[PDB]
């Protein structure tokens, strides 16, 4: 993969941090909507919705 | 008769030499960047870099 050992713009300038080894791109379209990643806050420690039976 | 004639055989110098036996073209680009030949040299006997694990 990327090495960037050739040029050192700065010392360890974002060159590597072994950021992660597991595939984690599984959200929204990546999971075809199966695992939807959203951003909408709600209060308390729950979120209750009611629908008819 | 041919025995009475002084016969000379042909000779020439074909000015060639054989580079090697194995294939060394298949080294970069042919290997999709798996093996790289860049032209940066390092002093001392070694080089190092850090990436914070």
TrEMBL record, chains A, B:
Q: Which domain of life is it from?
A: Viruses
Q: What is this protein called?
A: Major capsid protein
Entire-sequence positions represented here: 2 to 54 of 321
């Amino acid at each position: 993969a990327l090495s960037d050992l050739q040029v050192f713009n700065d010392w360890a300038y974002k060159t590597m941090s072994e950021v992660l080894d597991q595939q984690v791109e599984l959200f929204n379209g990546a999971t075809r909507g199966a695992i939807i990643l959203r951003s909408a806050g709600n209060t308390g420690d729950l979120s209750e919705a009611a629908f008819w039976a």
